[PDB]
Amino acid sequence: GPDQRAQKKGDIILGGLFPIHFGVAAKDQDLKSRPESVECIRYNFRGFRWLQAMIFAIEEINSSPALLPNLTLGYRIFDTCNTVSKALEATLSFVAQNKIDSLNLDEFCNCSEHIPSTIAVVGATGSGVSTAVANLLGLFYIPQVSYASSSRLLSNKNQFKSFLRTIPNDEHQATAMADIIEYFRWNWVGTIAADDDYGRPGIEKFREEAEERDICIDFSELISQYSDEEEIQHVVEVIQNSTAKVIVVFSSGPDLEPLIKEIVRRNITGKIWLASEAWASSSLIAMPQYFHVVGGTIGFALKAGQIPGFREFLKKVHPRKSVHNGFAKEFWEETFNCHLRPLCTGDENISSVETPYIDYTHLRISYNVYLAVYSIAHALQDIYTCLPGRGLFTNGSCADIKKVEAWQVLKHLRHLNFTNNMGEQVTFDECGDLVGNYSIINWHLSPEDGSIVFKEVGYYNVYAKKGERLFINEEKILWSGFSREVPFSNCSRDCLAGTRKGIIEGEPTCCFECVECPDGEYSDETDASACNKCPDDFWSNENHTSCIAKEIEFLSWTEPFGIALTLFAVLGIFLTAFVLGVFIKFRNTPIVKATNRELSYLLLFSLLCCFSSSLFFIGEPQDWTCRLRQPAFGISFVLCISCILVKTNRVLLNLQFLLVFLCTFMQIVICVIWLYTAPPSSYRNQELEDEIIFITCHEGSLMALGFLIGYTCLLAAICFFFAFKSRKLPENFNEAKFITFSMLIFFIVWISFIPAYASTYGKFVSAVEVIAILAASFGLLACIFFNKIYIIL
Amino acid sequence: PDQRAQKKGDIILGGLFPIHFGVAAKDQDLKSRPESVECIRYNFRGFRWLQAMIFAIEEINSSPALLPNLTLGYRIFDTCNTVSKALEATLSFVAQNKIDSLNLDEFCNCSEHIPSTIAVVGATGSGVSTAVANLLGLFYIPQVSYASSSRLLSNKNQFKSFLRTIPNDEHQATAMADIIEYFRWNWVGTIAADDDYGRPGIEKFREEAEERDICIDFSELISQYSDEEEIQHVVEVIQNSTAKVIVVFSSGPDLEPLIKEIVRRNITGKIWLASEAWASSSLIAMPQYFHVVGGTIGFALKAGQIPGFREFLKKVHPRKSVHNGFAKEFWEETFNCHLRPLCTGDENISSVETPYIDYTHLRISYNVYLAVYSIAHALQDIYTCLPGRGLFTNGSCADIKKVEAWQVLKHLRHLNFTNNMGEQVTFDECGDLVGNYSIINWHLSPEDGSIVFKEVGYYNVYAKKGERLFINEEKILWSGFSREVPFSNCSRDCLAGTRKGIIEGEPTCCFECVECPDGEYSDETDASACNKCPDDFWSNENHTSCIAKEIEFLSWTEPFGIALTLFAVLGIFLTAFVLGVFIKFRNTPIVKATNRELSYLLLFSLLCCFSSSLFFIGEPQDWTCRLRQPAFGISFVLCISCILVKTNRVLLNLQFLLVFLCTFMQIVICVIWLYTAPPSSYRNQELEDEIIFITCHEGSLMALGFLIGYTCLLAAICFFFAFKSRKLPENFNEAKFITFSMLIFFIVWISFIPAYASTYGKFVSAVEVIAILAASFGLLACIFFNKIYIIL
Ligand SMILES: CC(C)(Cc1ccc2ccccc2c1)NC[C@@H](O)COc1cccc(Cl)c1C#N
Numbered sequence A: 001g002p003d004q005r006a007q008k009k010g011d012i013i014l015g016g017l018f019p020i021h022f023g024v025a026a027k028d029q030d031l032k033s034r035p036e037s038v039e040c041i042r043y044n045f046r047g048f049r050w051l052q053a054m055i056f057a058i059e060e061i062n063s064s065p066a067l068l069p070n071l072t073l074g075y076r077i078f079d080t081c082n083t084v085s086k087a088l089e090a091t092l093s094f095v096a097q098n099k100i101d102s103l104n105l106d107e108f109c110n111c112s113e114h115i116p117s118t119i120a121v122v123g124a125t126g127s128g129v130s131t132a133v134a135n136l137l138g139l140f141y142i143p144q145v146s147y148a149s150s151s152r153l154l155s156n157k158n159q160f161k162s163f164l165r166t167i168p169n170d171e172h173q174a175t176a177m178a179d180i181i182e183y184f185r186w187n188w189v190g191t192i193a194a195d196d197d198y199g200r201p202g203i204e205k206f207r208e209e210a211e212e213r214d215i216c217i218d219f220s221e222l223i224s225q226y227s228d229e230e231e232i233q234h235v236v237e238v239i240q241n242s243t244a245k246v247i248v249v250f251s252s253g254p255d256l257e258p259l260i261k262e263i264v265r266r267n268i269t270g271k272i273w274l275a276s277e278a279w280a281s282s283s284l285i286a287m288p289q290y291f292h293v294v295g296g297t298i299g300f301a302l303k304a305g306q307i308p309g310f311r312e313f314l315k316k317v318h319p320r321k322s323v324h325n326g327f328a329k330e331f332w333e334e335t336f337n338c339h340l341r342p343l344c345t346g347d348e349n350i351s352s353v354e355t356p357y358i359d360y361t362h363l364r365i366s367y368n369v370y371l372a373v374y375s376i377a378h379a380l381q382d383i384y385t386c387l388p389g390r391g392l393f394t395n396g397s398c399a400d401i402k403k404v405e406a407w408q409v410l411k412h413l414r415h416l417n418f419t420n421n422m423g424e425q426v427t428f429d430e431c432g433d434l435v436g437n438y439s440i441i442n443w444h445l446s447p448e449d450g451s452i453v454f455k456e457v458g459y460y461n462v463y464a465k466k467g468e469r470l471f472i473n474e475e476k477i478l479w480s481g482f483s484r485e486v487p488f489s490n491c492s493r494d495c496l497a498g499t500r501k502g503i504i505e506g507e508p509t510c511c512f513e514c515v516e517c518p519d520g521e522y523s524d525e526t527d528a529s530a531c532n533k534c535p536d537d538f539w540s541n542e543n544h545t546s547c548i549a550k551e552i553e554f555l556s557w558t559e560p561f562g563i564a565l566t567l568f569a570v571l572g573i574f575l576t577a578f579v580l581g582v583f584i585k586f587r588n589t590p591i592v593k594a595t596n597r598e599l600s601y602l603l604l605f606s607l608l609c610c611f612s613s614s615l616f617f618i619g620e621p622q623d624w625t626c627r628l629r630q631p632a633f634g635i636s637f638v639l640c641i642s643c644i645l646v647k648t649n650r651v652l653l654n655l656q657f658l659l660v661f662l663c664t665f666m667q668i669v670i671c672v673i674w675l676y677t678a679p680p681s682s683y684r685n686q687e688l689e690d691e692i693i694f695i696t697c698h699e700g701s702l703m704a705l706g707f708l709i710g711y712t713c714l715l716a717a718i719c720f721f722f723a724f725k726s727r728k729l730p731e732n733f734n735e736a737k738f739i740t741f742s743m744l745i746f747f748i749v750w751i752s753f754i755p756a757y758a759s760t761y762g763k764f765v766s767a768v769e770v771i772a773i774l775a776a777s778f779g780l781l782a783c784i785f786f787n788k789i790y791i792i793l
Numbered sequence B: 001p002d003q004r005a006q007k008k009g010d011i012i013l014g015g016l017f018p019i020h021f022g023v024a025a026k027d028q029d030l031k032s033r034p035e036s037v038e039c040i041r042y043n044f045r046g047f048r049w050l051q052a053m054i055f056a057i058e059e060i061n062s063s064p065a066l067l068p069n070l071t072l073g074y075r076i077f078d079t080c081n082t083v084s085k086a087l088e089a090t091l092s093f094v095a096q097n098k099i100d101s102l103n104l105d106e107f108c109n110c111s112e113h114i115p116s117t118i119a120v121v122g123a124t125g126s127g128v129s130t131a132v133a134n135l136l137g138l139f140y141i142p143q144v145s146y147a148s149s150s151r152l153l154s155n156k157n158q159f160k161s162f163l164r165t166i167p168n169d170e171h172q173a174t175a176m177a178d179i180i181e182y183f184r185w186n187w188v189g190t191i192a193a194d195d196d197y198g199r200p201g202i203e204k205f206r207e208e209a210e211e212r213d214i215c216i217d218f219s220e221l222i223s224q225y226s227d228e229e230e231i232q233h234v235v236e237v238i239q240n241s242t243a244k245v246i247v248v249f250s251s252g253p254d255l256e257p258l259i260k261e262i263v264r265r266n267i268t269g270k271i272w273l274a275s276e277a278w279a280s281s282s283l284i285a286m287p288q289y290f291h292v293v294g295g296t297i298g299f300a301l302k303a304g305q306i307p308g309f310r311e312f313l314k315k316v317h318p319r320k321s322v323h324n325g326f327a328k329e330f331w332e333e334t335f336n337c338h339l340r341p342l343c344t345g346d347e348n349i350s351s352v353e354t355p356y357i358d359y360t361h362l363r364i365s366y367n368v369y370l371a372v373y374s375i376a377h378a379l380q381d382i383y384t385c386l387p388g389r390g391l392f393t394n395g396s397c398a399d400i401k402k403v404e405a406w407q408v409l410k411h412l413r414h415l416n417f418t419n420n421m422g423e424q425v426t427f428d429e430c431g432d433l434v435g436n437y438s439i440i441n442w443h444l445s446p447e448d449g450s451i452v453f454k455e456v457g458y459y460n461v462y463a464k465k466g467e468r469l470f471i472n473e474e475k476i477l478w479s480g481f482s483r484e485v486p487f488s489n490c491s492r493d494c495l496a497g498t499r500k501g502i503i504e505g506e507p508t509c510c511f512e513c514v515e516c517p518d519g520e521y522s523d524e525t526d527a528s529a530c531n532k533c534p535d536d537f538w539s540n541e542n543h544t545s546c547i548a549k550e551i552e553f554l555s556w557t558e559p560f561g562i563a564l565t566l567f568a569v570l571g572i573f574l575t576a577f578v579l580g581v582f583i584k585f586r587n588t589p590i591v592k593a594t595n596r597e598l599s600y601l602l603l604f605s606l607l608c609c610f611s612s613s614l615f616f617i618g619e620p621q622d623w624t625c626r627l628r629q630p631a632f633g634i635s636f637v638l639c640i641s642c643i644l645v646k647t648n649r650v651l652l653n654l655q656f657l658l659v660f661l662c663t664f665m666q667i668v669i670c671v672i673w674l675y676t677a678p679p680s681s682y683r684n685q686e687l688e689d690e691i692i693f694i695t696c697h698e699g700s701l702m703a704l705g706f707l708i709g710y711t712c713l714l715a716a717i718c719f720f721f722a723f724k725s726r727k728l729p730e731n732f733n734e735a736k737f738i739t740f741s742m743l744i745f746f747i748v749w750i751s752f753i754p755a756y757a758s759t760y761g762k763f764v765s766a767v768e769v770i771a772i773l774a775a776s777f778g779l780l781a782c783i784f785f786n787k788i789y790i791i792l
């Protein structure tokens, strides 16, 4: 197959596929010549590290007497070259003998089995590469234990029949990222994904999970190492134009480094980085000089494994010692820039030169290679101890450990369950997937150099139930580089009491607009979807803090206008009592004998009842009070006006007393008949002003109250007209002139109150009316009596 | 598999066709030895296609102009629609090249018993063909598929030898979108198969729909494994839509349960978009079911031209077939016996009707024929190649006996030839063909009653977008026997007069018709908003346009106007009668009794008052509204002052000067305030939307109150001066009539003020006049009438 290979032949052969070259040189064949295979022109240090890890694991299983004794494990490692075709060719190389045996018309070669039967293949890294290799291998039922290919597409086992892997699936990684976002109560986070089969499925699963967990995705940008600098700067700009301070990065370190450089140039030190496993264990991004730019990064990393003497084994790389692996020779030349360019001697010191794969603090992928190799070796050991009555096949059938076939190793690897050298339990299911415990780490400085120290800040345990898989000690984690405070990640602040969240079209539900509740609608609890409207009995303050009270409004005994009205009423009652006492004392004085004694007594009584009816419209209104406040005025003042009228009728020239009685009787019958027809009541009219409520009175019929007020006005007009005819004539101590003057006062008041009844309607209606009915009373009882007092005291 | 279709020749062609349609219904638990299992459901049409390939090979052999004296061999493997089976066959094809390429494997010392195959025909499974090309692309061995059509197969970062003889599904989806767009429909429901054919097609159709504003109601997936509940849900969502045009992108077996369910529920009359998969399938198209699903339009491949193909099909025989083992199986399953009862194999299939024998068109077989002839033409291109002249580096090309696949691939990627019918066929470097899709609609034949597929148009890819599709709509019979294009918009176009408003919850193509508000007009059908009329006009009930709002003010010609004109002319007649009586008599005793000049002034003021009544008439003007109130003031104050100076001298040339002084003070106040704030005319629209009123507004309301109060006060003074003096007779008892006339004036004022208030409306300019005239009609009557009564 490929010219470069690592081959050693023993009794058992394991497939080998790792990318030792960093990149294949892209090339399009002109088709004018015979087929040409594209070639890699780069070199990968970590791929060589993983290859060395596989070789050391195989050698250590060979040396260990307890595991697989009396056996030799050979290897055939072919560089992936990051190419599907190269891996397919290498896989073909692996399957030579069983393919020849299983293909008709090829048995005629009479082959002597020149290729030992490869049992299983370690690799490969490329996910689609792994898919194709599994497609080809499942035809022969030869197991493939991948170490770096992780994708939910690899979980489809209708095309795969021998697929197994030793790397956590991307579904778990995306779900763990979603769990990290959900745990810290964030909903506004940016997402960046790699433009490959590793980042795109991850971000798709992340979005699908965020749909369930009510998590929003501000932006979904794809970056790589081939993206233009303009694209990277555009990503940086939309990051700055983003409210989210938490950025979930699901990509590789090489894919992220240009963006990291651009952000470092622009000094954005407020973004929280969620790190995928690919770039959480890379030294291309972990730059302490850049730490303050990207400090506080949270990431998933594989726990360090136990590989004794791995660094010493790496120091044993030598083109002379290593003859079964040619790749090392290449790694030699690039270190010294010689080609045996000057000639290499093969003895130059290498301990004083550092390359990325030599330096490590923890092992993540080499550990996966080690575990996969040991899983294969443990299946081989289960075959080694197989007995006629032991094994996973019926009839208790086993196979020779020296002639082991892959169609038996496949069953052993599917039902395998053992313990690691550290003590970790390793098992497999019907899916054949191995998922480990991701370690959640943050970035810290060192108080001696300042180097980035990966402090374990939590663990994600896949063996636990979902909802408890994540554990994070928030105390250790730094935020914004070194600060100790959970950063705020929401599209909008939580609307406090008095502000509701209003759904806004064109934005996801996580981003809400806070809206002030209308007055009269209360929001007691913070973060309420709507504003609860207060009951009509009360009303809401602007703070909307649990609406408490409202404003009742009506005339009261205690208030400035109320005090003035009370004083005026008591003065009027005092004058009325003065007149009554003067009348009581004198019985046969000439001036009293001049007018009719009974009629004057009736007039005084009607004036008293009028002053009382003035007081009758006071205090908080009641149904009967509003039912009678107008009839009281009507009847009382009509009685008084009719008494004055019958004085004037006899003046002009016991009929007069009966006339007063008949008039007041007709009015009172009308009043009671209409009162039974439609009684006035009291209404608590809220719809006048929201803040203040008025409890007023409403009549049975407006026109019928107009009838009574017009009746009183008409009787007053008749009295005034009669006195006006008699104004000049002096009779009964010139009573007629005072009658005219008093009727003038009453008619003036009746004209005057109505503009004040209308203009200053407000609350003071119940006020103004009284200050009318009293004052008009204060007129009459004064005038028609004052003169008679002035001479008789 | 253990059965193969192999014939040996100088050149070997690869064959991958599904002889069986199903797959093994059991996957082992691997508790026993693991081994491949066999597909269990046969496919007659796959064997038919294999026979078509064999017939094409035989035709090439018989033709003396294409590859003479060169036998074309074949190695055809049954697919089972299985990925691994095709992978094993591909391995079989690439044995020698791989072994030579493999290191430490050439020690097998193979004599190269079977030469490497140059090209592979097949396969049907698109996902299968994916891995097939993945493996073949390693060695650059051309693979010309015939039934695998998918845009996912158009990738060229992995497919490096892939070619196909079936047009890409992108063209099919775009053509479906073009059918929807051409017939002007926006609401269509889409059903797709749960496989590698329906799903990419519906995805591409959805992608194309956004560009062409096509809207998709529902996207449902159906398959042969779907329960009856799923199919019934699909039927319900079909019935729950206004769309009669159904975009169906599915295979026949997947669609058949849905077809049976719809036939059961009797939904008569619909439009179906038929994919190539079910363009003419006998599992769907049946004469009995025509009335249920009549009016179907679908895409099909062009009819092929393969003479003798039916004869070769009639020539199949298990004893006469030595290079095709599967034919034996074809003889068994048809007759339900093995070569249960046994058969010798001496039967005949010509007289027995089976789906294999029956056919009316050639779509897949034509693709197989075209692929085989394309490979043959590439071989002939190698045949004509020279070592110093060719399409290669330095003209290097090996002998025809030493044919290599990579030489075949270069010729195939640049092929441009003509068919037996003469049609031009060319390929590209994308592995795609540029074939044309014909459009077929279902018609009944009154000769038999069978369904006849009439070619109603074509979708040609040799033209740019917007012109590729060509349909003769006249031929098409719609749902049932209807000749009218069915309606398939989301909702009817909002008629001019009502607007279309956006609603969220359904695609923006679907709109809500809302009646335009009054004051805004909709002059165009389908407008997102209602155009507001200019404030000079107002919209009619139909809201079609706004042509007339209303013009409102007192006019000479109207019932109240006629009454007012009659009353005014009567008043002017009485005034002229008084004036003439005054003119005639000069020294009569009654005129000498009162001051002659003062009475003349009173008559003049009454005339000016009647004129001022007329002054508030017709359409208002700036100066007219500027003076209509001062005119009343000045004139009636002059009259009232003349009566007042009569009364003042009665009670006991000062009186005339007093009138002049009073009217002068009023007129100076009037002019000073008139220069301060002139009244004008306002065309108040905000009183009622339909009708606009042109009224007058003063400079200051309180200032007009001043003048009216001045007039009322002078009237009160006159009434008082004549009130107590009512009894005293002087100057023919003038005082009594003075009191009576002042009463009339005051009554009229208190009478029109509530009339001015209540019936405001239009009749303000009416009511005021019927006041100012009637009050005038009072005074000029009273203070004069008595004097006429005795003197005539
Ligand atoms: C009639 C009166 C004003 C009582 C009253 C008091 C003192 C007086 C003193 C001197 C002479 C007459 C007097 C009359 N009470 C009427 C009010 O309650 C009720 O009226 C209304 C009630 C409802 C709606 C309206 Cl729009 C009105 C009025 N307008």
Ligand SMILES: CC(C)(Cc1ccc2ccccc2c1)NC[C@@H](O)COc1cccc(Cl)c1C#N
Pocket (backbone or CB within 6 Å): B629, B632, B701, B704, B708, B711, B748, B749, B756, B768, B771, B772, B775
């Ligand atoms: C004062 C007058 C009514 C003229 C007039 C006519 C005839 C008369 C006959 C006898 C005695 C007085 C008379 C007065 N013109 C007033 C009207 O234009 C304008 O007033 C208003 C204008 C605007 C708004 C209001 Cl709310 C009012 C009133 N209110």
